[PDB]
Structure 1
Amino acid sequence: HWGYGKHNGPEHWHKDFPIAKGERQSPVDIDTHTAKYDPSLKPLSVSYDQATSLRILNNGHSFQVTFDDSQDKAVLKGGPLDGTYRLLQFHFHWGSLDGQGSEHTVDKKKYAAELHLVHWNTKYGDVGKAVQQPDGLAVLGIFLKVGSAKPGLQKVVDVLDSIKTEGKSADFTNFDPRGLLPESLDYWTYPGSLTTPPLAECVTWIVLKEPISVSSEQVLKFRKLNFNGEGEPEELMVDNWRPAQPLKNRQIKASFK
């Protein structure tokens, strides 16, 4: 199946997932001079104090931390969104070198990694229904640059040895995702898609302007994960990012001047 290699990477995905060539695909390059300030946008409302993390897992293309989404415990509201969206999981995309790894770019600048917090619209009842709707998901995207360490990330870093290969999972309770947020919640937003198969065009993207800083030692440990399963030849999990897609007839809106 699909992946990020020469023979099964993003340039191949359209053969199995023809929506890869669709009209609202992600990621995109954010041109800061053509983004449109929109004064009708509201501040984001991030309510994560009651979040219940469950598991951390290596799914063969990234690693994810999952949350209990059976109640309104960790929700995203406001911004460009109508309604309440529940946090389901977060995961990262990263590079083999510090100058690549993010999926979105800003004036063509690539960051070392990108954090995606995936939320789904509770009006649709479960996440499987939400992925079939044009407003079903909201993904909060946060850029990572290399610099000072991020203390709130260290406990994710320290458990990655236990999920090195695809299919491994571990208990990962009492993790507070508020420690992954930058100080400012100013954002760009646009209508887009999942950046992995099935590439469904169901996502309101909210990309934060302010990156978080992580240390070289922290991102190094991402690069030690494996795409392969246990007992298979080692293949390092790096460069699990999709390149920017055509913007087509979309406008990126900014919440700030």
Structure 2
Amino acid sequence: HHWGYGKHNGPEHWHKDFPIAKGERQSPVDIDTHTAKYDPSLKPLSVSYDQATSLRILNNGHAFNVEFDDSQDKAVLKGGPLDGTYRLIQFHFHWGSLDGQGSEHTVDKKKYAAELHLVHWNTKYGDFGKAVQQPDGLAVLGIFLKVGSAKPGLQKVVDVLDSIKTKGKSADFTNFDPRGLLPESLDYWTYPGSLTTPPLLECVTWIVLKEPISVSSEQVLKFRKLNFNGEGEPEELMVDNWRPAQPLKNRQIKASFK
């Protein structure tokens, strides 16, 4: 009886195995835009993905992960609120059964159709598994998706999904350029938080872009054909794989703009 998003093992149950679920810096959160304060000390974000080397795409039973070679310092995130440098390890999405839900963060209670998470670990801790044990171990860049015009740079991802339908399937996925998933503006909100799935560790500096990307209805429809189950098990569509907003508690959300 492992955790998931289903009728009986979803977010409201996670605290029994992972009591940090009720902690002081859980994610996601609602971003109340009027109260977030512009911080003139914040720096432009520096996203340097020109050497990013993707390897593989994996259906892990929760989402699909596009994995990167993180053995050389390529594909790094720095600046913004961060001290030091963070190396890209993977990206994944969260999405809904319906276009009206799917994001983890919300903006004045608005839910987007989906949310992309680009996960990076702080190189001062040597690898990902040590970084997640530190309060400044990860930086996750979050990007909202709305349904409208297709995102041309997303299509290669969409088209490989039929080959990783079920939990535990992977496929080779080289030469994918994540720059094609970025919006025009790098204006952002930032706050200290957590992983949004078990083990829910409080190790993340969140950087959530204000500008959403547009993807087409057909692109997001193909996300929703994935399955949470493994091959040869009854079909459970991979939809609604998002954790709801959690209490902000003693945190401030800062804006890079305005």
TM range (shorter): over 0.9
Aligned alpha-carbon RMSD (Å): 0.3
Asked if 1:223 is matched to 2:257, the reply is no
Alpha-carbon distance in 2 for matches of 1:128, 1:97? 34
> Per-residue displacement from partner, 1:140-177 (whole Å, max 9, x unpaired)?
00000000000000000000000000000000000000
Aligned to 1:200: 201
TM-score (norm 1): 1.00
The DSSP-based 3-state class of the residue aligned with 2:71 is coil
Alpha-carbon distance in 2 for matches of 1:6, 1:231? 21
> Per-residue displacement from partner, 1:208-237 (whole Å, max 9, x unpaired)?
000000000000000000000001111100
> Per-residue displacement from partner, 1:18-43 (whole Å, max 9, x unpaired)?
00000000000000000010000000
Superposed counterparts of 1:17-56, under 5 Å: 17-56=18-57
How much has 1:5 moved relative to structure 2? 1.1
How much has 1:6 moved relative to structure 2? 1.7
Aligned to 1:180: 181
Alpha-carbon distance in 2 for matches of 1:122, 1:71? 11
How much has 1:10 moved relative to structure 2? 0.3
> Per-residue displacement from partner, 1:87-115 (whole Å, max 9, x unpaired)?
00000000000000000000000000000
The DSSP-based 3-state class of the residue aligned with 1:110 is coil
Count of aligned residue pairs for this structure pair? 257
How much has 1:71 moved relative to structure 2? 1.1
Alpha-carbon distance in 1 for matches of 2:51, 2:252? 34
Alpha-carbon distance in 1 for matches of 2:8, 2:227? 18
The DSSP-based 3-state class of the residue aligned with 1:227 is coil
How much has 1:65 moved relative to structure 2? 0.3
The DSSP-based 3-state class of the residue aligned with 1:159 is helix
Aligned to 1:6: 7
Structure 1 unaligned blocks of 5 or more: none
> Per-residue displacement from partner, 1:160-200 (whole Å, max 9, x unpaired)?
00000000000000000000000000000000000000000
Alpha-carbon distance in 1 for matches of 2:3, 2:54? 28
Percent identity, aligned pairs only?
A: 97
Alpha-carbon distance in 2 for matches of 1:136, 1:149? 34
The DSSP-based 3-state class of the residue aligned with 2:221 is helix
The DSSP-based 3-state class of the residue aligned with 1:230 is coil
> Per-residue displacement from partner, 1:76-134 (whole Å, max 9, x unpaired)?
01000000100000000000000000000000000000000000000000111100100
How much has 1:9 moved relative to structure 2? 0.3
Alpha-carbon distance in 1 for matches of 2:56, 2:92? 12
Alpha-carbon distance in 2 for matches of 1:93, 1:142? 11
Aligned to 1:126: 127
Alpha-carbon distance in 2 for matches of 1:119, 1:50? 15
The DSSP-based 3-state class of the residue aligned with 1:153 is helix
Alpha-carbon distance in 2 for matches of 1:203, 1:29? 16
Alpha-carbon distance in 1 for matches of 2:251, 2:45? 21
Alpha-carbon distance in 1 for matches of 2:97, 2:7? 15
